[PDB]
């Protein structure tokens, strides 16, 4: 068995001009049979967003893992943790269990408050930092997004244009994949506020 | 404060002499071993009217063929009986037989030296030695009925009859005259019951004494308060017969 | 004061009173000496006969470590027999790890560190002996003496026990008369003579002599007990000097 | 008042068990000197064999801790053996973890921290010794670092330890206010052994036989002690002048 | 005093009170006397009992088929040192197929008592042993002291008023050591030896305990009606 | 053996004081004076290097230390007790906060970890409290410049400026007169030298005074120039030559 | 060996009292006063600072009011160093409970654990107990608003208003006089400062000598908002009540 | 690990650390137990010294160990929350292994045991707590009432009391309780506990709390109004 294709899912994240977007599909399978469509992959601590794909049980463990560490962090230093730091923290937590890893591929996205510079980061199973100025992808159809995103993407989109791109990127790759679909959620992160949009896509 | 394993200039262990004092605060137990079976009797002592005198536990079965009557700090005894009951059951697992009373008593007195400070924490387990003495009666295939007095000195003697507890030295002087080998089991039952009547502060009745025996055939039987009331009535009649 | 009640507590004098009392436990013991020969070493011990019941020459108080180190101690025989027993493990794990018999100057440090450790902590007694050990190795002869401080040095000759004031002076006569080197056969005769003279303090109870030696020319570097004709020839030289 | 029996802050702020340890050291009536040359460090130390039975060569106070850090100790000799065995182990361990030869600084700072641990725990007495490490470092050239039973250590242009140290200290102060440098200038290292001995003779007021000194020289690449003949050679060269 | 708190402390003269007190514990105990020749070794033991109804306490412990000891003093401590000798007699018979020499057994006890009075939180042992045994090199009789010292003797006693029997044996030394080949006469020399220490408590047939081991004799104990021959 | 040092040596006394900790503070009042002033764009911390002999070199010895690239320290009291604390602190910044966040701790968080080492020294068994008080200057991006004092009980407070040591009473009252909020880095240094000249009887020059600032950033110690995302140390220790220059401009 | 130096702290005295516990309380009456008044829709926490100077930094300071998680705060009276270890195992224990149930820990459980840890330090180990008393001011959904105090004994009890630190006799007398049960957060604000003006050692109460904190049901939605007042908000609340 | 011997015998034959634990039970507030025909009643005293408390969330001195066993204590309140916790853990542990509920004797012996151990472990002082543990055996109706002590002794009673001034309220019970014929109904038993506790309460009606345990897992604490009702009736009986 492939410890990642039991449940599938895909996550994609893009920068724009002073904003980021992180979006995914909502399916949760046990191989052929589809179980649930309510399962969300995207969680938020403070104003930093974390998408996690892969073995479904380690998505739940690793979400309650990082909520723990950041709450303690927020009580000592008295401020939400910044995205630049939080990325070292994901990495160190993973590599801590080098042998017998969590089978996941986290993706960070947020805007650093002090500077206003939007920021995204990717990972793999053990835990290396994929740094990009373009877009980060993750999941079982990560081959299909890499080709999809690169054709669409234009540097610097305004927040309501960014919302179109990252939709076409995620919609097409899900219906060319046999483990994604059943709706999708897209967050648009700006400094002031966060706007969450549920997508109407096909149920095949 | 004077150590736990410090020897005194007299050449003894402080803590073991003290614990010897704590056995004489306990309430009296008496045993008489004959050739028909041993008879154990205790002074229970109802501390108030309210008390249910029937929860005072001072005679405990250890196995089918081993009785036990205890005197002293009965609190420290909960731990000796757990170990004995285990040691007796283990031997019956390991060699499918009953253990001579002399051997079981060796095992009880091995706990009773384990008091101290150790050199790295070994198999030590107390801060102080045990504060309770046992009278372990029983019957084994080889040597008939035995009766041992296990002391917190670590040493057991085999007695023909012994009286420990508050009224021990008065009772011990009265056993020293009256014991002989003629005693049938009816004579011996009544004899223990009568020496308990002299050292008991209250009047003799079935709610503050308890008798028992161990016979080879029926095993170890604790008597019911209704059996003893028949023997209290036999004593009253025969002491006034004269 | 009160600086004596427990071990390894300094006093204002600097003295470590517990160790000073330990030296008094050595001075109570029986007498022993060691001669550093030209090519070996000789050991001698005064074994007091306490009763006629004691069997003769079965309570030997000279112990060998490995197969080329003689140890002989005064003070409390148990404390020493535990120091020697421990010395045997240190020497056997040297010969295990480097596959060569342990040099005598090395074996001296390992025993010192083990004594010395018993004046760091305040929950183990100091050792109540002084040990005179040595033997032959690749360099030649060495003679050492060890105190309850942890202090040891090389010696041309050494002596401890009750009769040590006597014997230090007598030893010194034999080092001034022979800078050339008292030869190995000659030193068995002299050892017995020194023990017989230093026995004049203890002349209450008869004693028994026991000599042993480790010598390069004689026993080929091993450790043996001088015995039979040669121990008897020495005892005769010793009776002839005192009378 | 259990503050003079273990190391706890006295009612006054002192650590009486430590202040006592210093007076335990100065008791062997050995007087030690260490002065720096241009490319070497000389240390000369009094040797005093008390009785003719003790063998002369085994008595000693200079130890060879590694290949370039010699350490002359002042105190009772069992504590010295204890401090020496432990220092040798660290100079080996260092070369094994980091792959170069333990500089002198680093060793002196390691023993200091090891000393501190014994005045903080209640179950060890402090060591009763003053340790003086001498080397020709690789980086900083000639060095001396003297360490104490408190834990304190500090660098030195030249030092003297023992009961009669006051005589030597004030003699060294006079010489470095004259010459206005931090180190004996003379170029060869035999001239600096000569210099060390001459200030000892003046300070203590007494001359030396060759059996009364034990001498140790650190040049780059080796530390060594000098034999009774190489000492005799210096002594005769000072008497000539 | 002040220094008798722990065994970690030497006194100002060098003595170890905690070790001299443990010695006392043997003078409270009952007398036992041991003697030996070249062919056999013997222990004569006074068994002590409490009041009348009490039975006598066993003073003789069988350690193996060729070695045993008697105790005098604390009966709980004897059973802790004899348990430790039992393990040693097996440990030799399994690993070297070798009857454990008596000279070695003594030096093992010596080492075990020493570690137990140096440790903080130990206690000296308060018991004396006469260990008899027959090995490859012949018969031996050892006296064990709580100090640690193991001494090899021809005869000796320990206990209460031992001095009477200790003297008797040094006068008769030449006669009872030459009793070779007659086990019966060596026991009779020992019964006499214990009657010097007895003041009151005449011997009984339930009072006396004899052990004899030798060249042709596995270790045997005579109790009860088996000691009617030697009174 | 059976080491029985589990019971703590510090016990509550019948008067509601923690005996050992009180005494510790006596020995901190005998240590040498040190002071720190917090300004708008830096902190300065300074002390006198007591040279015990002219043979001794107090150059090799240091009473001011680097803890991270942006947090210095200075101290009053026992020399040894200081040096082993600086080594626990250097270590625990790295093992327990730098690996597992990728950043040097913010100043007020390190102090919290250092206040935790004092606590364990007075709670756990068989130890005596430390004989020192630290001043810990430091800078982090969200709180700015900050100065902290730590005690041998474990308590820490943030100070606007402060002194501890022998002449602490005379130093703290001279700082309240001369302190205000406008102080730049240059003026606060000049107020730091005046305050130390009161409490120092002997030599007072650049070879015998130690002075170090947390101030503006340095890209000259950076050491690997050619990368804009780094900024390099903020701590810089003033050398002997620099210190004599602010005495000509006294 | 080391038998002599034992303080044997944990044994009873002849009266049945633990010596080390009785002392720790006396030590705690030297720390600055802390007061809690619970009203129908929130809690007030006002504590009087100790140590103050014109040269002490006050704004960033925090010495007596610590936050535990989202909905629970405490006030410290006693050794601030000792307490800082008990505050760190409180936080850890809180989030560990959130990790296992997905609920904000009930106030009753987070109190009961810090009292077991205090009790367990007088039971064994021969260590001197912590010199701390806490006022747990917390809010869950089960019972609404709660107050608790604990003492170096371990024993804890619930209060509608309570004082620890100095003049607990004097402060508890005033509080019984003026408390009422229809109170609201803004009346309790007024009472908490009115008690601290009378018990103060100061010649005059001042904003720079106060740590002030509220927990109000107030604030958007049902969620609870914990607010540690800025030093600047305290100057405003102190003119509002007219003490200055 | 701490090793010292806190419990040693004294030349007289007593452990002093056990006698001092008893004194820590005299200071504690009163607890009294009375067992009737077919119910037990546990009544505790509360302090009025402490006032302005919140009565809702004050931790009661009656705790439930299981569905049908109650334990009240006198003495150090801190020490008792440890015993209570181990009893509960034991109660469920015994439901996994035996597949039955605890008999009321098995829970008593086990609490008594944890108390015994703590008086012969080096490094640990004794508990300062005596408990009363009442309940109903499973599949039966009888009342069982047991008392433990910080020494480790336990025994069954008809009516008992521990805590402050327990001799006065024991003397009341020794002539009032008819042991041949238990108190009749449940109410008359509660009347007896309230009467017994009024001799030592030194004024108080809202300082007495009553919890009653009946068979078939019915534990119910009486409200304030129901206790106030029995106190008024008892004040009319007194007046003559």
Swiss-Prot record, chain A:
A Pfam family reported for this protein in Swiss-Prot or TrEMBL:
Proteasome
Q: Where is this cross-link: Glycyl lysine isopeptide (Lys-Gly) (interchain with G-Cter in ubiquitin)?
A: 69
List Phosphoserine occurrences by residue.
Answer: 30
Q: Which of UniProt's keywords are assigned here?
A: Cytoplasm, Isopeptide bond, Nucleus, Phosphoprotein, Proteasome, Ubl conjugation
Tell whether Nucleus is among the UniProt keywords: yes
This entry carries the following GO cellular component terms, namely:
cytosol; nucleus; proteasome complex; proteasome core complex, beta-subunit complex
Cell inner membrane: is it a keyword of this entry?
A: no
Please classify the protein's predominant subcellular localization into one broad category: cytoplasm
Q: Name its GO BP terms in alphabetical order.
A: proteasomal ubiquitin-independent protein catabolic process; proteasome-mediated ubiquitin-dependent protein catabolic process
- A Gene Ontology molecular-function term? endopeptidase activator activity
Q: Where in the cell is it found?
A: Cytoplasm; Nucleus
Q: How does it assemble?
A: The 26S proteasome consists of a 20S proteasome core and two 19S regulatory subunits. The 20S proteasome core is composed of 28 subunits that are arranged in four stacked rings, resulting in a barrel-shaped structure. The two end rings are each formed by seven alpha subunits, and the two central rings are each formed by seven beta subunits. The catalytic chamber with the active sites is on the inside of the barrel.
The family assignment reads: Belongs to the peptidase T1B family.
Q: What is this protein called?
A: Proteasome subunit beta type-3
- Organism per entry: Saccharomyces cerevisiae (strain ATCC 204508 / S288c) (Baker's yeast)
From Swiss-Prot, chain B:
**Its job:** The proteasome degrades poly-ubiquitinated proteins in the cytoplasm and in the nucleus. It is essential for the regulated turnover of proteins and for the removal of misfolded proteins. The proteasome is a multicatalytic proteinase complex that is characterized by its ability to cleave peptides with Arg, Phe, Tyr, Leu, and Glu adjacent to the leaving group at neutral or slightly basic pH. It has an ATP-dependent proteolytic activity.
Q: How does it assemble?
A: The 26S proteasome consists of a 20S proteasome core and two 19S regulatory subunits. The 20S proteasome core is composed of 28 subunits that are arranged in four stacked rings, resulting in a barrel-shaped structure. The two end rings are each formed by seven alpha subunits, and the two central rings are each formed by seven beta subunits. The catalytic chamber with the active sites is on the inside of the barrel.
Looking up InterPro entries in the UniProt record yields: Ntn_hydrolases_N, Proteasome_alpha, Proteasome_alpha-type, Proteasome_alpha_type_5, Proteasome_asu_N, Proteasome_sua/b
Spell out the SUPFAM superfamilies in the cross-references: N-terminal nucleophile aminohydrolases (Ntn hydrolases)
Question: PROSITE patterns of this UniProt entry?
Answer: PROTEASOME_ALPHA_1, PROTEASOME_ALPHA_2
The alphabetical list of record keywords is:
Cytoplasm, Nucleus, Phosphoprotein, Proteasome
Please describe, based on the UniProt annotation, the reported consequence of changing residue 41 to D.
In DOA5-1; slight decrease in activity
Where does the protein end up? Cytoplasm; Nucleus
Q: Which organism is it from?
A: Saccharomyces cerevisiae (strain ATCC 204508 / S288c) (Baker's yeast)
Gene symbol of the encoding locus: PUP2
Tell me the residues on which Phosphoserine occurs: 48
Record keyword Cytoplasm present? yes
Q: Which residues carry this modification: Phosphothreonine?
A: 47
Curated annotation (Swiss-Prot), chain D:
Q: What else is known?
A: Present with 15200 molecules/cell in log phase SD medium.
Purpose: The proteasome degrades poly-ubiquitinated proteins in the cytoplasm and in the nucleus. It is essential for the regulated turnover of proteins and for the removal of misfolded proteins. The proteasome is a multicatalytic proteinase complex that is characterized by its ability to cleave peptides with Arg, Phe, Tyr, Leu, and Glu adjacent to the leaving group at neutral or slightly basic pH. It has an ATP-dependent proteolytic activity.
Which species expresses this protein natively?
Saccharomyces cerevisiae (strain ATCC 204508 / S288c) (Baker's yeast)
Q: What is the protein named?
A: Proteasome subunit alpha type-1
Tell me the Gene3D superfamilies matching this sequence: Glutamine Phosphoribosylpyrophosphate, subunit 1, domain 1
Q: Which domain of life is it from?
A: Eukaryota
- Covalent cross-link (Glycyl lysine isopeptide (Lys-Gly) (interchain with G-Cter in ubiquitin)), residues: 222
Protein family per UniProt: Belongs to the peptidase T1A family.
List UniProt keywords, sorted A-Z.
Acetylation, Cytoplasm, Isopeptide bond, Nucleus, Phosphoprotein, Proteasome, Ubl conjugation
Where in the sequence is Phosphoserine found? 227
The record's note on quaternary structure and interaction partners says: The 26S proteasome consists of a 20S proteasome core and two 19S regulatory subunits. The 20S proteasome core is composed of 28 subunits that are arranged in four stacked rings, resulting in a barrel-shaped structure. The two end rings are each formed by seven alpha subunits, and the two central rings are each formed by seven beta subunits. The catalytic chamber with the active sites is on the inside of the barrel. Interacts with CIC1.
UniProtKB/Swiss-Prot annotation, chain F:
Question: Position(s) of the covalent cross-link Glycyl lysine isopeptide (Lys-Gly) (interchain with G-Cter in ubiquitin)?
Answer: 108
Which InterPro entries does the record cross-reference, listed alphabetically?
Ntn_hydrolases_N, Proteasome_alpha, Proteasome_alpha-type, Proteasome_asu_N, Proteasome_sua/b
Instruction: Name its cellular compartments.
Output: Cytoplasm; Nucleus
Q: Name one GO biological process term.
A: proteasome-mediated ubiquitin-dependent protein catabolic process
- Record's Gene3D superfamilies? Glutamine Phosphoribosylpyrophosphate, subunit 1, domain 1
Family statement drawn from the similarity comment of this UniProt entry: Belongs to the peptidase T1A family.
The identity of this protein, by name, is Proteasome subunit alpha type-2
Q: Which gene encodes it?
A: PRE8
């Amino acid at each position: 068995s492939d410890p990642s294709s039991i449940n599938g899912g895909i996550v994609v994240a893009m920068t724009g001009k002073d904003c980021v977007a992180i979006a995914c599909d909502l399916r949760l399978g046990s191989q052929s049979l589809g179980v649930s469509n309510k399962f969300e992959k995207i969680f938020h601590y403070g104003h930093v967003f974390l998408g996690i794909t892969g073995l479904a049980t380690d998505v739940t463990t690793l979400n309650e893992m990082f909520r723990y560490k950041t709450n303690l962090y927020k009580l000592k230093e008295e401020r939400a943790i910044e995205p630049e730091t939080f990325t070292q923290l994901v990495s160190s937590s993973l590599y801590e269990r080098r042998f017998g890893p969590y089978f996941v591929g986290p993706v960070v996205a947020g805007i650093n408050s002090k500077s206003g510079k939007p920021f995204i980061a990717g990972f793999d199973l053990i835990g290396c930092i994929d740094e990009a100025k373009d877009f980060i992808v993750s999941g079982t159809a990560s081959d299909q997004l890499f080709g999809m995103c690169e054709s669409l993407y234009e540097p610097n989109l305004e927040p309501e244009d960014l919302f179109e791109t990252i939709s076409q990127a995620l919609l097409n790759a899900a219906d060319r994949d046999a483990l994604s679909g059943w709706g999708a959620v897209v967050y648009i992160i700006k400094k002031d506020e966060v706007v969450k949009r549920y997508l109407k896509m096909r149920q095949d | 404060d004077r150590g736990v394993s410090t020897f005194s200039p007299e050449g003894r262990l402080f803590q073991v002499e003290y614990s010897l004092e704590a056995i004489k605060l306990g309430s009296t137990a008496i045993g008489i071993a004959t050739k028909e079976g041993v008879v154990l009797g205790v002074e229970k002592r109802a501390t108030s009217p309210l008390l249910e005198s029937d929860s005072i536990e001072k005679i405990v079965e250890i196995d089918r063929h081993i009785g036990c009557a205890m005197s002293g700090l009965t609190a420290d005894a909960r731990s000796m009986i757990e170990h004995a009951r285990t040691a007796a059951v283990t031997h019956n697992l390991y060699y499918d037989e009953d253990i001579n009373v002399e051997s079981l008593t060796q095992s009880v007195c091995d706990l009773a030296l384990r008091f101290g400070e150790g050199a790295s924490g070994e198999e030590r387990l107390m801060s102080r030695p045990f504060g309770v003495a046992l009278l372990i009666a029983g019957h084994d295939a080889d040597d008939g009925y035995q009766l041992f007095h296990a002391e917190p000195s670590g040493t057991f003697y085999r007695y023909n009859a012994k009286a420990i507890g508050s009224g021990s030295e008065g009772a011990q002087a009265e056993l020293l005259n009256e014991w002989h080998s003629s005693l049938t089991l009816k004579e011996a039952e009544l004899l223990v019951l009568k020496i308990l009547k002299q050292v008991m502060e209250e009047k003799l009745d079935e709610n503050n004494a308890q008798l028992s025996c161990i016979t080879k055939q029926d095993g170890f039987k604790i008597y019911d308060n209704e059996k003893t009331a028949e023997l209290i009535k036999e004593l009253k009649e025969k002491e006034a017969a004269e | 004061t009160g600086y004596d009640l427990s071990n390894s507590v300094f006093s204002p004098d600097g003295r470590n009173f517990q160790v000073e009392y330990a030296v008094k436990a050595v001075e109570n013991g029986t007498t022993s000496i060691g001669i550093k020969c030209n090519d070996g070493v000789v050991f001698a011990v005064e074994k007091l006969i306490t009763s006629k019941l004691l069997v003769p020459q079965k309570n030997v108080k000279i112990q060998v470590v490995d197969r080329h180190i003689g140890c002989v101690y005064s003070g409390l025989i148990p404390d020493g027999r535990h120091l020697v027993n421990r010395g045997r493990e240190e020497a056997a794990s040297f010969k295990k790890l480097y596959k060569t018999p342990i040099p005598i100057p090395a074996f001296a440090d390992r025993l010192g560190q083990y004594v010395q450790a018993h004046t760091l902590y305040n929950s183990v007694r100091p050792f109540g002996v002084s040990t005179i050990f040595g033997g032959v190795d690749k360099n030649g002869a060495h003679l050492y003496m060890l105190e309850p401080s942890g202090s040891y040095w090389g010696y041309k000759g050494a002596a401890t026990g009750k009769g040590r004031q006597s014997a230090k002076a007598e030893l010194e006569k034999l080092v001034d008369h022979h800078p050339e080197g008292l030869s190995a056969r000659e030193a068995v005769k002299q050892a017995a003579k020194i023990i017989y003279l230093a026995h004049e303090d203890n002349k209450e109870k008869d004693f028994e002599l026991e000599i042993s030696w480790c010598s390069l020319s004689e026993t080929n570097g091993l450790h043996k007990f001088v015995k039979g004709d040669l121990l008897q020839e020495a005892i005769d030289f010793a009776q002839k000097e005192i009378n | 008042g259990y503050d003079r029996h273990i190391t706890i802050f006295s009612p006054e702020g002192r650590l009486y068990q430590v202040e006592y340890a210093f007076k335990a050291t100065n008791q062997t009536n050995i007087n030690s000197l260490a002065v720096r040359g241009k490319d070497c460090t000389v240390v000369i130390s009094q040797k005093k064999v008390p009785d003719k039975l003790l063998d002369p060569t085994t008595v000693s106070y200079i130890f060879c801790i590694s290949r370039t850090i010699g350490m002359v100790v002042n105190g009772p000799i069992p504590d010295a053996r204890n401090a020496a065995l432990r220092a040798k182990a660290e100079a080996a361990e260092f070369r094994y973890k980091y792959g170069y030869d333990m500089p002198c600084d680093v060793l002196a700072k390691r023993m200091a921290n090891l000393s501190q641990i014994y005045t903080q725990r209640a179950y060890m007495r402090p060591l009763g010794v003053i340790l003086t490490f001498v080397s020709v470092d690789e980086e900083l050239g000639p060095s001396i670092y003297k360490t104490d039973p408190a834990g304190y250590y500090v660098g030195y242009k030249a030092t003297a330890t023992g009961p009669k140290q006051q005589e030597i200290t004030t003699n060294l102060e006079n010489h470095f206010k004259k010459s206005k440098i931090d180190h004996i200038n003379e170029e060869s290292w035999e001239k600096v052994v000569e210099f060390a001995i001459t200030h000892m003779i003046d300070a203590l007021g007494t001359e030396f036989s060759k059996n009364d000194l034990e001498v140790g020289v650190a040049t780059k690449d080796k530390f060594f002690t000098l034999s009774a003949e190489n000492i005799e050679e210096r002594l005769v060269a000072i008497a000539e002048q | 005093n002040n220094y008798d708190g722990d065994t970690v402390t030497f006194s100002p003269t060098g003595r170890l009170f905690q070790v001299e007190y443990a010695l006392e514990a043997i003078k409270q105990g009952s007398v036992t006397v041991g003697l030996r020749s070249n062919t056999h070794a013997v222990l004569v033991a006074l068994k002590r009992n409490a009041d009348e109804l009490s039975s006598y306490q066993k003073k003789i412990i069988k350690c193996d088929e060729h070695m045993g000891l008697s105790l005098a003093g604390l009966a709980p401590d004897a059973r802790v040192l004899s348990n430790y000798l039992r393990q040693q007699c097996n440990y030799s018979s399994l690993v070297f197929n070798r009857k454990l020499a008596v000279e070695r057994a003594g030096h093992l006890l010596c080492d075990k008592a020493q570690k137990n009075t140096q440790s903080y939180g130990g206690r000296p042992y308060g018991v004396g042993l006469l260990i008899i045994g027959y090995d490859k090199s012949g018969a031996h009789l050892l006296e064990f002291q709580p100090s640690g010292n193991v001494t090899e003797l021809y005869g000796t006693a320990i206990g209460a008023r031992s001095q009477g029997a200790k003297t008797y044996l040094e006068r008769t030394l030449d006669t009872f050591i030459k009793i070779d080949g007659n086990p019966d006469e060596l026991i009779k020399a020992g019964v006499e030896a214990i009657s010097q220490s007895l003041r009151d408590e005449s011997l009984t047939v339930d009072n006396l305990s004899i052990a004899i081991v030798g060249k042709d004799t596995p270790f045997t104990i005579y109790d009860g009606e088996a000691v009617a021959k030697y009174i | 053996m059976t080491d029985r040092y589990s019971f703590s040596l510090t016990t509550f006394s019948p008067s509601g004081k923690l005996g050992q900790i009180d005494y510790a503070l006596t020995a901190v009042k005998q240590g040498v004076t040190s002071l720190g002033i917090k300004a708008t764009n830096g902190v300065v911390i300074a002390t006198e290097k007591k040279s015990s002999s002219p043979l001794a070199m107090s150059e090799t010895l240091s009473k001011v230390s680097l803890l991270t690239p942006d947090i210095g320290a200075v101290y009053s009291g026992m020399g040894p007790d200081y040096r082993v604390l600086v080594d626990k602190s250097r270590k625990v910044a790295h093992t327990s906060y730098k690996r597992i966040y990728g950043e040097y701790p913010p100043t007020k968080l390190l102090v919290s970890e250092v206040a935790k080492i004092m606590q364990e020294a007075t709670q756990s068994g068989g130890v005596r409290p430390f004989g020192v008080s630290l001043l810990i200057a430091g800078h982090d991006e969200f709180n700015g410049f900050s100065l902290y004092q730590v005690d041998p009980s474990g308590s820490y407070f943030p100070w606007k400026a402060t002194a501890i040591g022998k002449g602490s009473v005379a130093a703290k009252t001279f700082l309240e007169k001369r302190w205000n909020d406008e102080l730049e880095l240059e003026d606060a240094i000049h107020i730091a030298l005046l305050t130390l000249k009161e409490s120092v009887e002997g030599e007072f020059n650049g070879d015998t005074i130690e002075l170090a600032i947390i101030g503006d950033e340095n890209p000259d110690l950076l050491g690997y120039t050619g990368i804009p995302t780094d900024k390099g140390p903020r701590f810089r220790k003033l050398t002997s030559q620099e210190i004599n220059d602010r005495l000509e401009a006294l | 060996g080391s038998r002599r130096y034992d303080s044997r702290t944990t044994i009873f005295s002849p009266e049945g009292r633990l010596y080390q516990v009785e002392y720790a309380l006396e030590s705690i009456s030297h720390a600055g006063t802390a007061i809690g008044i619970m009203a129908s829709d929130g809690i007030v926490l006002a504590a009087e600072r100790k140590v103050t100077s014109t040269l002490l930094e006050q704004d960033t300071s925090t010495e007596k009011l610590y936050k535990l998680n989202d909905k629970i705060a405490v006030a410290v009276a006693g050794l601030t160093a000792d307490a800082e270890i008990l505050i760190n195992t409180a936080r850890i224990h809180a989030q560990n409970y959130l990790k296992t149930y997905n609920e904000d820990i009930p106030v009753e459980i987070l109190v009961r654990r810090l009292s077991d840890i205090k009790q367990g330090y007088t039971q064994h180990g021969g260590l001197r107990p912590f010199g701390v008393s806490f006022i747990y001011a917390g809010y869950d959904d089960r019972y609404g608003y709660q107050l608790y105090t604990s003492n170096p004994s371990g024993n804890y009890t619930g209060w509608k208003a309570i004082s620890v630190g100095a003049n607990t006799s004097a402060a508890q007398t005033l509080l019984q006089m003026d408390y009422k049960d229809d109170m609201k957060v803004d009346d309790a604000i007024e009472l908490a400062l009115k008690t601290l003006s009378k018990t103060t050692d100061s010649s005059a109460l001042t904003y720079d000598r106060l740590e002030f904190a509220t927990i109000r049901k107030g604030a958007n939605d049902g969620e609870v908002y914990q607010k540690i007042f800025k030093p600047q908000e305290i100057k405003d609340i102190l003119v509002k009540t007219g003490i200055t | 690990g701490y090793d010292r011997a806190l419990s040693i015998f004294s030349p007289d034959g007593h452990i002093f650390q056990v006698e001092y634990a008893l004194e820590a039970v005299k200071r504690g507030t009163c607890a009294v137990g009375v067992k009737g025909k077919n119910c037990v009643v546990l009544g505790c005293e509360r302090r009025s010294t402490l006032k302005l408390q919140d009565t809702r969330i004050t931790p009661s001195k009656v705790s439930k160990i299981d569905s049908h066993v109650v334990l009240s204590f006198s003495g150090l309140n801190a020490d008792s929350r440890i015993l209570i916790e181990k009893a509960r853990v034991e109660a469920q542990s015994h439901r996994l292994t035996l597949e039955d509920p605890v008999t009321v004797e098995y829970l008593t012996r086990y609490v008594a045991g944890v108390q015994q151990r703590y008086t012969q472990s080096g490094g640990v002082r004794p508990f300062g707590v005596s408990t009363l543990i009442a309940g109903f055996d499973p599949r039966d109706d009888e009342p069982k009432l047991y008392q433990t002590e910080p020494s480790g002794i336990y025994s069954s009673w008809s009516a008992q009391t521990i805590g402050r001034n327990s001799k006065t309220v024991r003397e009341f019970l020794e002539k009032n309780y008819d042991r041949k014929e238990p108190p009749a109904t449940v109410e008359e038993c509660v009347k007896l506990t309230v009467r017994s506790l009024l001799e030592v309460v030194q004024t108080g009606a809202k300082n007495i709390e009553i919890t009653v345990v009946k068979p078939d897992s019915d534990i119910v604490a009486l409200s304030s109004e129901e206790i106030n009702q029995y106190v008024t009736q008892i004040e009319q009986e007194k007046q003559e």
